[PDB]
Design a protein around this ligand. Structure first.
Ligand SMILES: O=c1ccn([C@@H]2O[C@H](COP(=O)(O)OP(=O)(O)O)[C@@H](O)[C@H]2O)c(=O)[nH]1
Length: 321
């Protein structure tokens, strides 16, 4: 069968969700399905402006009742109404906040699923011990660790934040580090070389593009990142309290309250203030860190992508009769 995913690569994709879904198909139903990201039986939109038009194309031909049209919402809160369309067979929601929002849009209960934000199946294989993961990455085994990243392209004031962290997580009365940093620069090669060439006074590992994010996050105790939905969902599955340091205008604004309101992290654009929060969490406010970690795990939706595609399967199995 033919699976057609569509998405605006013009930055906001969401690529991460599209590939995660494709990965889900291949791993679950094998060659039974054949998927393409961008003659389809099922059609998936992971974008807030590829609903109406792509739908009118199926209404003004009558190919609607033929092929299924779903939607995987990627904002986590305070969405843009354009995700919601009555002519949608199913609208997958990453949270109750959004589901209850879809209800207001007038989407019937049979049109709404709340499985969570789809994360790579390759991510969701379960936890390895923290000591082992750290050893594999060349990190110190015992020091609490903050993961610092900025999506696939390594955006954000990463260097300034790393510097602030280096000064903030060094105890000058024992003359040693009380914390450590794992930096993932993604595809930002320029940043990777800059950071790698500097001497850091606490343990700092600089990586480029990571494919086994699950392990990197598993090695750490909290995370600093821009408010990307994919990273947020991944961090919560790994019980990582989140310090959001900013967001891409329009695309990622609604994700901030989802983290803060649910007790899963904090927001701050100041490298210095961020480093203060981490030193606090790694020191006198460790209790708070654990509580936020627990909050994150309770909201984590590791099986999201599986439930979504299976529901997509049971859908095509019944539209072709
Ligand atoms: O070195 C890297 C950097 C990023 N990512 C992945 O890239 C995705 C980024 O998605 P997000 O929604 O957080 O950022 P956006 O797609 O909006 O740029 C996440 O799933 C990360 O796990 C990765 O696998 N390795």
């Amino acid at each position: 069968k033919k699976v057609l995913i569509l998405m605006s690569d013009t930055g906001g994709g969401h690529r991460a969700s599209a590939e995660a879904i494709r990965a889900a198909f291949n791993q679950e139903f094998g060659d039974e399905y054949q998927v393409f990201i961008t003659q389809p039986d099922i059609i998936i939109s992971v974008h807030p402006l590829m609903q109406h038009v792509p739908l009118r194309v199926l209404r003004s031909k009558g190919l609607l009742k033929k092929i299924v049209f779903t939607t995987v919402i990627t904002d986590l809160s305070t969405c843009h109404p354009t995700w919601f369309h009555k002519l949608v067979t199913r609208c997958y929601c990453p949270s109750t906040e959004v589901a209850k929002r879809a209800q207001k849009a007038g989407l019937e209960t049979s049109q709404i699923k709340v499985y969570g934000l789809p994360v790579r199946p390759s991510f969701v294989k379960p936890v390895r011990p923290k000591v082992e993961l750290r050893r594999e990455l060349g990190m110190d085994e015992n020091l609490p660790a903050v993961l610092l990243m900025g999506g696939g392209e390594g955006m954000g004031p990463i260097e300034a934040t790393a510097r602030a962290l280096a000064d903030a997580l060094y105890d000058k009365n024992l003359g040693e580090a009380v914390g450590q940093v794992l930096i993932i620069c993604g595809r930002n090669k320029k940043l990777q070389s800059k950071l790698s060439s500097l001497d850091w006074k606490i343990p700092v590992q600089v990586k480029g593009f990571i494919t086994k994010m699950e392990e990197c996050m598993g090695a750490c105790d909290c995370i600093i990142t821009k408010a990307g939905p994919g990273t947020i969902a991944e961090a919560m599955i790994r019980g990582l309290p989140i310090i959001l340091n900013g967001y891409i205008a329009g695309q990622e604004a609604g994700n901030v309250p989802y983290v803060v309101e649910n007790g899963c992290g904090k927001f701050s654009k100041s490298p210095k203030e961020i480093s203060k929060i981490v030193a606090d969490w790694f020191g006198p406010a460790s209790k708070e860190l654990e509580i936020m970690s627990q909050n994150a795990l309770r909201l984590a939706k590791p099986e999201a992508v599986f439930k979504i595609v299976h529901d997509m399967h049971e859908l095509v199995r019944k539209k072709n009769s």
